[PDB]
């Protein structure tokens, strides 16, 4: 905002934010939602992740790590995060153990800029 600049942000790990809030939320006396997380799980990520964005003044370009607990991608902590992201990188354990590193399962992955308008036609095809 102030200096007006392109900046990188590196959050390792964004699950630990949600998990940290899950500890206090129990002791604060809130009733837990699905899978024992705080009821404000979507709202906690909302106010944090919305601040991470490219404004007119400058530009944040945030890489984040997301822990998938028990390799369960349907869990609220990653599932809620997926909606916020521009390029979702999904790492699979079976791909890692087979020998392929990095362990990126390309079918579950996605990117917004995977589009003939942004990247070249030869890239997309």
């Amino acid at each position: 905002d102030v200096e007006g600049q392109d900046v990188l942000l590196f959050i390792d790990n964004i699950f630990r934010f949600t998990q940290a809030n899950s500890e206090v939320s129990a002791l604060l006396g809130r009733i837990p939602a699905a899978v024992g997380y705080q009821p404000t799980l979507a709202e906690d990520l909302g106010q944090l992740q919305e601040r991470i964005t490219s404004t007119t003044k400058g530009s944040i370009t945030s890489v984040q790590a997301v822990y998938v607990p028990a390799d369960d991608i349907t869990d609220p902590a990653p599932a809620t995060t997926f909606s916020h992201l521009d390029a979702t990188t999904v790492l699979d354990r079976a791909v890692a153990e087979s020998g392929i590193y990095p362990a990126v399962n390309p079918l579950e992955c996605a990117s917004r800029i995977m589009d003939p308008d942004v990247i070249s036609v030869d890239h997309y095809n």
Binding site: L28, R30, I31, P32, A33, A34, P39, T40, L41, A42, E43, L45, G46, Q47, Q49, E50, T53, S54, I73, T74, A79, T80, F82, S83, H84, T88, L107, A110, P116, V121, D122, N125
Partner: protein
């Protein structure tokens, strides 16, 4: 808007993020249920809130909406004594708006809390609503006033198919009488902020903002707004419905609304049940979707069509929020993840998808071709599991035709499907169907100096669209003239254009063939 204060009902006692409870002021006035209340954050500014609990003590449970950081304990609370009304009309179109009604910078009011039309108020759905997709408009046809669910995983094309349905209306709406124009209302519940901006620009570039208004409650904004966002969306549509006009309502998505309502319910100590949701989470979506309807001739004959989106986690329909919305809506449009990555886009799983009022909803012309397609694809799917028959050839071409990025015009869709039905793409190979379809719509081979001689029927004349809708293709007026156009197009395409494929077996020509064919998938 700036709401109307009346009486100072109490003081703020506790806050818990976006929820609060009040203590009543001396006298114990008692605010009415489900009404707006203004909390004085400063002498000049207020902060809105909705009443959700009226306890025996005199205490009043509040759902915070505006200026949540500025709310504090001990602040004064003024009451409206009224249900939430918002700005509604034609003047609100082409703008982004909150559930409370404030415009986002980038008209008589109407109640958000309203009962749905009763038994004698409604009528059977007859008017069609074109999504602009050959897969949908044939097999899973949506009628005006119908509630058609969109389900599937993340990045399966749930938003795109809903947004392109709004964009498909502009070509019709521009040409038709404004009485029958489909005014759209895209509700964005719990989404990322930049996603709303990209949809705004995408709607603006296709001229959709003229016939569209964008309800918006982003992820930054609180649960109170997200909870109320689909209700504010329908209110804006009901104006057009009750005043004899047809409307469309997209909720993107009801999954994030439920999570926002669960937050509100849990924070106010409402007893939770299945997957920690309250008892009335079914009632939440039910009273929303039932307000979408097709009214009778006695009350204008207007409509609000609903396209609720509901995200599933790894193709799991057994989840509580997903199973609830399926039981309310009139069937669904299931988007499979394997079909998306496989190639088929939109990735519409026809076996899983269904429209409960399909036949009556379709156009007379579209009903003619589509009735046969159900018989062909049924036999093709069975024979594919278990030597090429006529159904096997023609069935495979339909699958190639269903792939499309942007929505097709009704004339350009139905003719390319009619060609495949009567078997004009049998000699044409499966990979060259999109090149065949492109040369049918934009270009024309008969007129391309030679064997033309048609008196009226051509594809460049887009105005024939509405004559086809009246008379159908299978009719003495257009049947003979249409079958000329297709006979000229096939014979010339097979002779002059498809002859290249036996030829082209070299570097820089095979690649040129690919780049040509890949671009043909996008433009229908």
């Amino acid at each position: 808007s700036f709401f109307k204060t009346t009486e100072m009902i109490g003081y703020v006692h506790s806050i818990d993020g976006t929820i609060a409870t009040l203590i009543p002021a001396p006298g114990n006035p008692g605010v009415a249920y489900n009404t707006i209340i203004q909390i004085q954050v400063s002498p000049t500014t207020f902060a809105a809130g909705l009443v959700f609990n009226l306890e025996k003590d005199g205490r009043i449970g509040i759902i915070l909406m505006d200026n949540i950081t500025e709310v504090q304990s001990g602040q004064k609370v003024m009451a409206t004594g009224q249900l939430l009304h918002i700005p509604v009309g034609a003047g609100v179109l082409g703008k982004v708006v909150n559930p409370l009604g404030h415009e986002v910078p980038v008209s008589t009011l109407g109640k958000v809390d309203t009962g749905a039309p009763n038994i004698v108020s409604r009528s059977p759905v007859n008017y069609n609503l074109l999504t602009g997709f050959k897969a949908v408009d044939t097999m899973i046809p949506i009628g005006r006033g119908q509630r058609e669910l969109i389900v599937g995983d993340r990045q399966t094309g749930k938003t795109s198919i809903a947004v392109s349905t709004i964009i498909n209306q502009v070509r019709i709406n521009q040409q038709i009488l404004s009485k029958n124009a489909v005014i759209s209302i895209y509700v964005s519940i719990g989404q990322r902020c930049s996603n709303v901006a990209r949809i705004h620009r995408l709607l603006q570039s296709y001229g959709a903002l003229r016939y569209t208004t964008v309800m918006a409650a982003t992820a930054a904004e609180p649960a109170g707004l997200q909870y109320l966002a689909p209700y504010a969306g329908v209110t804006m549509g009901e104006y057009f419905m009750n005043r004899g006009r047809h409307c469309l309502c997209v909720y993107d998505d009801l999954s994030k609304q439920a999570v926002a309502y669960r937050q509100i319910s849990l924070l106010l100590r409402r007893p939770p049940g299945r997957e920690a949701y309250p008892g009335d989470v079914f009632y939440l979506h039910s009273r929303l979707l039932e307000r979408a309807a097709m009214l009778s001739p006695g009350k204008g004959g207007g409509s609000v069509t609903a396209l609720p989106i509901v995200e599933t986690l790894s193709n799991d329909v057994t989840a509580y929020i997903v199973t609830n919305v399926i039981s309310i809506t009139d069937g669904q449009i299931y988007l499979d993840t394997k079909l998306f990555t496989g190639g088929q886009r939109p990735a519409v799983n026809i076996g899983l998808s269904v429209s409960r009022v399909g036949s009556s909803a379709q156009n007379a012309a579209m009903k003619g071709v589509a009735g046969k397609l159900k018989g062909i694809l049924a036999e093709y799917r069975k024979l594919a599991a278990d030597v090429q028959t006529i159904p096997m050839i023609r069935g495979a071409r339909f699958v190639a035709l269903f792939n499309q990025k942007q929505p097709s015009y009704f004339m350009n869709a139905i003719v390319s499907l009619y060609a495949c039905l009567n078997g004009y793409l049998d000699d044409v190979k499966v990979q060259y169907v999109k090149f065949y379809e492109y040369l049918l719509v934009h270009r024309d081979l008969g007129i391309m100096y030679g064997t033309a001689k048609n008196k009226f029927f051509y594809m460049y004349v887009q105005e024939l669209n509405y004559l086809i809708r009246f008379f159908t293709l299978n009719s003495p007026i257009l049947h003979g003239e249409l079958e000329e156009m297709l006979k000229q197009h096939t014979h010339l395409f097979l002779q002059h254009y498809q002859s290249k494929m036996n030829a082209i077996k070299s570097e820089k020509d095979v690649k040129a063939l690919k780049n040509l064919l890949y671009s043909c998938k996008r433009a229908v």
